[PDB]
Design a protein around this ligand. Structure first.
Ligand SMILES: CC(C)[C@@H]1N(C(=O)OC(C)(C)C)CC[C@@]12C(=O)Nc1ccccc12
Ligand SMILES: CC(C)[C@@H]1N(C(=O)OC(C)(C)C)CC[C@@]12C(=O)Nc1ccccc12
Lengths: 237, 242
């Protein structure tokens, strides 16, 4: 009933890597005005997500066409995990990147649909109730990435094997943090289930804006719209 | 050790699970497996109608489901119907033949489904889930617990009493946890993977919904009872009443 040096070492690598993310600030930073803002800001985040993904052990070792498959699906779900981490209960303003803060009302002005926005905030509220630290968020992101249930995964068993170390670490970490509360760990996992619904709802939202004359940029269209020239280039570096 | 209350609950579930999948191709008869496109669709829908009713009967036997409001019961059943069905496809997947089985003994190839006009996006995940489920290697108690856990999801659409639903689920999660510990003390990661399979059921259920809409474009519209649960609840409300 205690972590290993290997497990301790991995968690530190993840949070350290995770800390390199969301570094860009609104001061330091250089309908459609609202839209362009989001897409612009997504590209920054996506690019950070790919970089984070190379750092994690056992990811670069996978073949390229499955590295695409895991990233394509999880990238939105990571974003959602990160929006939830910095969700502020008092203001009800989700933070994106270092310091960009947006109320739920701010989103309606971008023309996002109520079927899409409310679940995001319900997700952010629900996760805040769990009370996860940076280590638990970092482990949960990794677990999320190595999802072998994603569409068009060529080597599922290889991916399942990569993920299992992160589950075992998270199980042991939660047991130490709350020995009395045995079901908090399952509660955290049941949240992974909520992420998919939001992932499917997101595919409906993105589509709807294509109708409103709001087409996605080159990088974001590769992974969200129904070749991966940009995506290969980011991975190959 | 396992609780006396917990033993009863598992026992009630497995028994209820036993009443499911009693129908045989030999035992009335559903429209036969072979216009050709149209007939295969019919074959599936008649069989599914039959399956849905057993799931509904099973769900009433599950404890505390009937504690719920008729509106919530309906919400819960409609969303998990496909997910229970797919658990069952996986449960009895033959790795030797790669043929999934439906009800008592209706066996189908991957090849068959392509022939029925189903899209790859839909078909591939189903066999992958059946394969992935096998790697876990669940026993009957474990399947049944996982099913009951599935039913009581608070984050389902149109649920009115989430807390009441989630309260009914925790007992089952606790039983599954306790059961895994007793049966396999040294395998700590087995129990989380089972819970994570619920994540896979969601993607499937979403993929399945897309398939149903694509089929409507093939001039293949679902019958009344399946249309309630899968299209975008009079018969289902009436089914609960018996
Ligand atoms: C509305 C948001 C939830 C945005 N989402 C999204 O898919 O964007 C579309 C505009 C629908 C294409 C998900 C992440 C999103 C984004 O893309 N950029 C961004 C910047 C700050 C906060 C949140 C976001
Ligand atoms: C294609 C199948 C996977 C069938 N399902 C489904 O949703 O397909 C529709 C065409 C939309 C109806 C899911 C269970 C399904 C069914 O309805 N009857 C049936 C009989 C034997 C095996 C599998 C099935």
């Amino acid at each position: 009933v205690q972590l290993t040096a290997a497990q301790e070492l991995m968690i530190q690598q993840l949070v350290a890597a995770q800390l390199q993310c969301n570094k860009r600030s609104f001061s330091d930073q250089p309908s459609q005005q609202r839209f362009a803002h989001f897409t612009e800001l997504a590209i920054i985040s996506v690019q950070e997500i790919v970089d984070f993904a190379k750092q994690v052990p056992g990811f670069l070792q996978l073949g390229r066409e499955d590295q695409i498959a895991l990233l394509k699906a999880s990238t939105i779900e990571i974003m959602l995990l990160e929006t939830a981490r910095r969700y502020n209960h008092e203001t009800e303003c989700i933070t994106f990147l270092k310091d960009f803060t947006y109320s739920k009302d701010d989103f309606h002005r971008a023309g996002l649909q109520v079927e899409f926005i409310n679940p995001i905030f319900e997700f952010s509220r629900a996760m805040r109730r769990l009370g996860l630290d940076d280590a638990e968020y970092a482990l949960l992101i990794a677990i999320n990435i190595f999802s072998a249930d994603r569409p068009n995964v060529q080597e599922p068993g290889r991916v399942e094997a990569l993920q299992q170390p992160y589950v075992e670490a998270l199980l042991s970490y939660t047991r130490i943090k709350r020995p009395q509360d045995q079901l908090r760990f399952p509660r955290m996992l049941m949240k992974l289930v909520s992420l998919r619904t939001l992932s499917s709802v997101h595919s409906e939202q993105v589509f709807a804006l294509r109708l409103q004359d709001k087409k996605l940029p080159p990088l974001l269209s590769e992974i969200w719209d129904v070749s991966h020239k940009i995506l290969h280039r980011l991975l190959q570096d």
